[PDB]
Every structure is written in C-alpha cells, then in structure tokens.
C-alpha cells in the first residue's frame, strides 16, 4: 500500500549534495518485491534482516535516494570514512537501516559528458550525521579577502562529475536508495 514504485521507479534523481528526502508511512508495505528483484547487485542490510521484519512494524521508515559514482558505493556504511562518505552524506553510528544500489549506465549518461550531477569537494568542518548542507559560495584558501570574485585563493566548491557510456566498470553512475527503520516510544505508531 506504500507507493514503493515512486521512490524506486522514478525518473529524475538529484545529485548527492541535493539528496532527496522521501518520508513514508501510513500503509501496509510489501517487501517481496525487494526480496527477489533479480536486478539489485548490492543489497546489503545492517542490524535488522529484511527476511524477518514482516512481523514487526513501527513508524520512521525514513528513506532517501540519489545517484553516485560506482566505486564509492562501499563508502556508505556506519563507521566508514572517505571523501563523499565524510563530506556529502554520512551515516551515524549504531545503524539500523538497509542499503540498496543498482546500475543505471544505460540511461543516465550521454556521450561527451553529462555535466548535470555535481558533488562537494571540501569543507572547513566535518558534517554531523543525517544533516544536509547546500551552499555555492566561494572558498577562500588564504589571507586574501575575497567577496564574490574568483581568484588564486578563491575557488568554486561544487565540482561536476564526468559520465561516459564507455566509462570504466566502476565509473558508471549507480542509483542508490537507503531505507532506515527505527521506532519511537511515542504512541500512534503506524505499522507496515
């Protein structure tokens, strides 16, 4: 009864720095479609198994999705460090969610480079878990006061990806959706 098609079978996925929230509840959710889709290549799940969650049911089915370069699909795991893992989207510790990813090279790429998907490269601090930062202002490397101009120490933070149909076996952009099943002691707990 939960529209799992819209989150899974959509058309436009935003970039990692503009990852899309998708809150979902108030249904009965069927997982057999996720059981044996025969197309996901990296179905991995932490804390709670998906073969046996059918009995139990809470709220907080917080789940999101984006598109990301293939290799770093391993870097999305609690207690794991990396460039995008630290710097664009980082899981907390004590995980309870469930990661799913699959290849979509056939459609989300155009010869010559599809310059639409970008990702942050640096940040002064390191982000807290499950928080979003979107900001396009310049980076001031050194002691030069920079207001709105680009220079030897003023650099554009956001950088564009490179997607090719004939890219490397990890260089194609995969689609990633991660679900996260939690609970709260408050009443009015809608099941699934």
């Amino acid at each position: 009864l939960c529209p799992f098609g819209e989150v899974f079978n959509a058309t436009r996925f935003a970039s990692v720095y503009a990852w899309n929230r998708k809150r979902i509840s108030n249904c009965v959710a069927d997982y057999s479609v996720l059981y044996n889709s025969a197309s996901f290549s990296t179905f991995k799940c932490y804390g709670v198994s998906p073969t046996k969650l059918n009995d139990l049911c809470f709220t907080n089915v917080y789940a999101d999705s984006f598109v990301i370069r293939g290799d770093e699909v391993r870097q999305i795991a609690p207690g794991q460090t990396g460039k995008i893992a630290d710097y664009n989207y980082k899981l907390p510790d004590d995980f309870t969610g469930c990661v799913i990813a699959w290849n979509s090279n056939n459609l989300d790429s155009k010869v010559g480079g599809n310059y639409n998907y970008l990702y942050r490269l640096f940040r002064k601090s390191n982000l807290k878990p499950f928080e979003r930062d979107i900001s396009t202002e310049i980076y001031q490397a050194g002691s030069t006061p920079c207001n709105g101009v680009e220079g030897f120490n003023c650099y554009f933070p956001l950088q564009s990806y490179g997607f090719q149909p004939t890219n490397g076996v990890g260089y194609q952009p995969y689609r990633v959706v991660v679900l996260s099943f939690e609970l709260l002691h408050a009443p009015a707990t809608v099941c699934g």
Epitope: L1, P3, G5, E6, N9, A10, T11, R12, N106, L107
Partner: antibody, heavy 127, light 108 residues
Framework: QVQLVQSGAEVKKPGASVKVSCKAS????????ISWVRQAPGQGLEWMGW????????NYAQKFQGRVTMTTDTSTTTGYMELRRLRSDDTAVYYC????????????????????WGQGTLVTVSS | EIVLTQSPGTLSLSPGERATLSCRAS???????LAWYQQKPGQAPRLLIY???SRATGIPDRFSGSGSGTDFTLTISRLEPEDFAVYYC????????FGGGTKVEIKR
C-alpha cells in the same frame, strides 16, 4: 487481470453537458491514478487528463480548463468525468485507463504509462 | 510543446517480414519517458512497450524498442497476420503528446 468497465454510448443536443463513468476492479484502487483519453472517428488520440487517487489534487490538460471536471470515489472505486459546453464537433470515443506515469501519491514522473484500458465509449451530439 | 510525427502514415508490408517503425520529435527527450501503444480496429488500445526498452505483461517476444536522443525505433521482427493495427508512439517528458498513427497493410 484487472477489470475496467464504462457506460454505454450517449446522444446529446448542443449546449448540454455529459457525464460518464469508469469502474475499476481487481487491484488496489488507492495505489494508481486514472487517465482519460479521447479519439475522434478516423483521427488519432489526444490526452484529456490524469487524476490521482489519494490526495485528490489532479492535473488537467492545458487546452481544456473550462469544460471538464474530474471526480473519483474510493468507496465504490469509480471515476467520473463531466464535460460541459459540448458542441456538435465533439462527437468522439473516450477511454479510461490506469496510469503509470504520474504517481498517485506525490505526483512525479515514473517509467511506464497507461497499462490497462477500458472498452471505449461513444458520444454523439447533433441538432 | 514537442511536435511528433512518425511517418510514413502507411507501412503496408507483406506478411512474414520485419517492421521498423520510426518515431521522431523536434527537441531532445529522455530515453525513459516514452512508450509505444497498439490499436486494433474496433478494439481498445493496449500497452506494447514502455521505457523504450522493456516489455509489459504477456507480450510476445517479437517486439523490441531502441533509440535515443531524438530518434526512436520499434522493431516487430516477426509479422503475423494478427499484428495488423494502428500503432502510436507517445511521449510524457513534458506534459504528454501522442503521435499520428501508422497503418500496416497486406501487400498483394
């Protein structure tokens, strides 16, 4: 295997309004949207409209704002369309179908489209 | 919006051949927002191809789809004496616009 049923052919006089119905069965009616498409005799199809099934917010065609009204009822799992200001040039065939292009929950484009249709309905009007 | 003309309006072919319908627009379009529908005479339309490469439930394996950019192709491969109908290429990238229809007829 889902079933779609429409009413019979209708005859009108100019200046009137026409109400038609579509009945769906064999699937969760609250999980997909409804699409209405017409075809003139001997000519190609043209899109009337799409309507969600949970939020009630819909999406009409750009050219038909002031003539058509769309309604759905979850209790009997039915979808009715009322077309106003009919003229003698509107004699045609209509079709109701299940959408797989605009999600019936949030309303974003997906992969696929009008999967199962009805039996078609014939409408005529003259002086 | 987007203009769409399949052309030619008649693709009369002898039975036992291959059919390659071509659908074309003006601007560019996604490869995942277009479909191909079938229309038997005196009979309701049906879904044939969605996603420009996939197939629906209970579809004979003779039907395939390909193309990209602004040009798309539907391949029938095997033409049986049941597959004579009016076919439509349809887009839904921006709003939705239907094609002009194509008629396949028996040569003699």
């Amino acid at each position: 295997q889902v079933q779609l049923v429409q009413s019979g052919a209708e005859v009108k006089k100019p200046g009137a309004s026409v109400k038609v119905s579509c009945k769906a069965s064999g699937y969760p009616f609250t999980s997909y949207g409804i699409s209405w498409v017409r075809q003139a005799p001997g000519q190609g199809l043209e899109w009337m409209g799409w309507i969600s099934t949970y939020n009630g917010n819909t999406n009409y065609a750009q050219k038909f704002q002031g003539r058509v009204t769309m309604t759905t009822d979850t209790s009997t799992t039915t979808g009715y369309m009322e077309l106003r200001r009919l003229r003698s040039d509107d004699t045609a065939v209509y079709y109701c179908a299940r959408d797989y292009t605009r999600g019936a929950w949030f309303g974003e484009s997906l992969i696929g489209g009008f999967d199962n249709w009805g039996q078609g309905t014939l409408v005529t009007v003259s002086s | 919006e987007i203009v769409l003309t399949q052309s030619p309006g008649t693709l009369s072919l002898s039975p036992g051949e291959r059919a390659t319908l071509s659908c074309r627009a003006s601007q560019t379009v996604s490869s995942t927002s277009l479909a191909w529908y079938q229309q038997k005479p005196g009979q309701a339309p049906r879904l044939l191809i969605y996603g420009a490469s996939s197939r629906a439930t209970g579809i004979p394996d003779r039907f395939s789809g390909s193309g990209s950019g602004t040009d798309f192709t539907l391949t029938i491969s095997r033409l049986e004496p049941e597959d004579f109908a009016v076919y439509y290429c349809q887009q839904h990238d921006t709003s939705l616009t239907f094609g002009g229809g194509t008629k396949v007829e028996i040569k003699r």
